[PDB]
Write a protein that binds this ligand. Structure first.
Ligand SMILES: CC(=O)N[C@H]1CN2/C(=N/Cc3ccccc3)SC[C@@H]2[C@@H](O)[C@@H]1O
Ligand SMILES: CC(=O)N[C@H]1CN2/C(=N/Cc3ccccc3)SC[C@@H]2[C@@H](O)[C@@H]1O
Lengths: 430, 436
């Protein structure tokens, strides 16, 4: 009973109901099975966790939950009361149960209590009735598991959800020790890897955590999350997670890009990786993902003479175009092959600038040609028929086209306020 | 007859019909009078200028154009054919004519043709039939003006639509000379001033262009546009345009931020500037007037009281005027940070340079702490924005305020460290940008 799919768990503009339904369509298609509802800035999920859904909100959640049954996706409703709750106060515990009862009434079987990204300092009144912070969470958590009659699927995200976040370390964490002991064994535990956005989730780290968690954890994977850096998109494939981890985990839910339509690769290649050992090749999973993704660009959501201006809209998006895009907007820790290369070629064309000086002039002329592929990719994308995809990635495609059209003017100049205030500070740090 | 209002004229996700109706309501409330429709990447405005509106698209346009009439806002439909039209071919001219006649039947009485951000190089058949790019544009433009019955308002936007873009200068541009000579006299010409994004629009610069084009232009103002730089947002006031320009202009249409709800200040301050001259206009007082009005929208969607022993309500403190004054100073104008933003940059420039002395080590200890306080007001500003009841405004600004909150907290912990991986910020674009 392995939970594998998508947590809508990021900061900023949540997905709307139309997009979530369509995500169910895509999860079923690729043979994944779980959706965790946890959008940090959907007001009633965290900031106003006490507030009851209105009739209109109730109706849209009922329809969305129905839509998840219709596509054989398990809908897990998460709630985040960490910022605000007095755990010792029973009227608070009552408020949380009322909120979770309304959601069961919408036809929701599965649930989650998240405690991630809050400070570990309790109030005077919780300090009295509870030993440590973990104790207070485990109490509230278990009592809710039980009140809801021990559902099959009931997740718990600890405040210490990655390696780095464990004080003083993983295996001697007194917050985590208490989670493995006092928290009921039917409740599952969420974990992001060594770090918040793990580069790798190695098997050593999962055995280690399991030992003190005293369970196989559900992985909350932030590998493709772009909520933390305005300029960054992640179109690269699932990587740094081995097929070997599947038997050591109760599940893997990926928290991908804020822009819905850019999670084709992230959610596709994750399915390639799950099929693999229910072995896995990143560079092949991606070509598989990109080839199918290319299908959507041509579906919405004169034949000029030899003396006449040719059609600007003539050329359509091509698997090469998309392959470049993905290399430009790859992963949180490596650029794609063509990306890291364009970069190197620029570093050297800048250093060895030479006022056998021919190795340069017909080497930075292969660059003026490769900078024109970035420009070509934007122009064809700006003309594609699926405007929904374009709009979702417009800001990012424009940005990289702009920096490469300025890097071009430069690496062809050597032969003859950008970012606002945030930028001016950035350019004065490390 | 002065056209003052908004042009939806920018690259990227256009506004949806609900937002446009909301715009007309705001324009009327602030006593502005014009909307120019020209979204670079709305489907059938530019790339697919030729295709006619579906029956569904036609219903939406008609509802929008009636909404404009109901709100006493002039609706100007613009089209951008110059990427791939052939100007000599009377079938291409007939397609353009068809497109505009369709919109005319939707209720539209005002039109525009735009020839901006296309390359200068014509093709063979056009080169044969027309003397210059200007000759071709003036030709099909004058035709269309006359076909639609010489409507009271019809705009032209040149390929050479600012100073930097005129070859080889404004005064001696043969392109603009052709436009001023040939282009019919009842058509108005749009101008972005000395630059695409003009810091100032000096009156001298309006008399210069007015001569080579032989009329008072209509400004297309890109002062608050933010399509060109992913990290930028402009919440500062209308600034750098004398009220002396008004009597020397046919109008001002501002092309503001992509994010609809970030344009309260941009549009509100333009209104104040316009209305001040129908020292008349202070940007700073315009800005306070706008943020004061804007603040009221924040606590409106688009009980347990804890004891002294218990955890207080995270969501308790609502957005203040001082929070919005800080936000605007952080995201001000294209060529100027606001006072608090410049100040915060100055005290950090200095704490970094005079770092050694950690005597004058009595000063630095004070300064670094007053700086930690200010970084604190940026975090507090984020926290209260993310709790506000208007999730629509929050969503449009989220990524901007998240970013300045996260950079100020990096900077704050660098200044703390000097007194002693979410956290390669920018991706690939980043690393290329750091070599220029
Ligand atoms: C349980 C979990 O993954 N929660 C978060 C983690 N995270 C972030 N957290 C905030 C943070 C900022 C700076 C440094 C560390 C942590 S940002 C990316 C992701 C965000 O999508 C996600 O909901
Ligand atoms: C008449 C007019 O303003 N047209 C355009 C100009 N412009 C831009 N031009 C593209 C450009 C990119 C790079 C360098 C120079 C120019 S971006 C801002 C604005 C954009 O909103 C607007 O539609």
């Amino acid at each position: 009973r392995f939970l594998c799919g998508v947590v809508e768990g990021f900061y900023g503009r949540p997905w709307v109901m139309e997009q979530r339904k369509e995500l169910f369509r895509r999860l079923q298609k690729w043979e994944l099975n779980t959706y965790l509802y946890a959008p940090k800035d959907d007001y009633k999920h965290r900031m106003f966790w006490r507030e009851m859904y209105s009739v209109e909100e109730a109706e849209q959640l009922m329809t969305l939950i129905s839509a998840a049954r219709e596509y054989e996706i398990e809908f897990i409703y998460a709630i985040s009361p960490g910022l605000d709750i007095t755990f010792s106060n029973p009227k608070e515990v009552s408020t949380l149960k009322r909120k979770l009862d309304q959601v069961s009434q919408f036809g929701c079987r599965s649930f989650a209590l998240l405690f991630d990204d809050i400070d570990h300092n309790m109030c005077a009144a919780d300090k009295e009735v509870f030993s440590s912070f973990a104790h207070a969470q485990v109490s509230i958590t278990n009592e809710i598991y039980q009140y809801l009659g021990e559902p099959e699927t009931f997740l718990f995200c600890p405040t210490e959800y990655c390696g780095t976040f464990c004080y003083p370390n993983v295996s001697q964490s007194p917050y985590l020790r208490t989670v493995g002991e006092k928290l009921l064994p039917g409740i599952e535990v969420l974990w992001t890897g060594p770090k918040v956005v793990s580069k790798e989730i190695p098997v050593e780290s999962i055995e280690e955590v399991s030992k003190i968690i005293k369970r196989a954890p559900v992985i909350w994977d932030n590998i493709h999350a772009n909520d933390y850096d305005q300029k960054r998109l992640f179109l690269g494939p699932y990587k740094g997670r081995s097929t070997e981890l599947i038997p050591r985990l109760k599940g893997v839910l990926t928290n991908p890009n804020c822009e819905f339509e850019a999670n084709y690769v992230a959610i596709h290649t994750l399915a390639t990786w799950y099929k693999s050992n229910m072995l896995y090749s990143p560079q092949m999973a991606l070509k598989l993902a990109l080839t199918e993704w290319l299908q959507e660009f041509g579906v919405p959501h004169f034949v000029p003479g030899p003396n006449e201006k040719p059609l600007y809209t003539a050329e359509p998006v091509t698997l090469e175009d998309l392959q470049l895009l993905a290399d430009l907007f790859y992963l949180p820790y490596e650029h794609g092959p063509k990306g890291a290369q364009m970069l190197r070629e620029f570093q050297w064309l800048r250093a060895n600038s030479s006022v056998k000086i021919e190795e340069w002039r017909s080497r930075a002329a292969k660059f003026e040609e490769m900078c024109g592929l970035v420009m070509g990719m934007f122009t064809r994308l700006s003309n594609c028929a699926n405007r929904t995809i374009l709009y979702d990635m417009y800001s990012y495609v424009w940005d990289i086209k702009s920096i490469m059209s300025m890097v071009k003017s430069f690496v062809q100049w050597l032969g003859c306020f950008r970012g606002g205030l945030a930028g001016e500070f950035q350019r004065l740090l490390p």
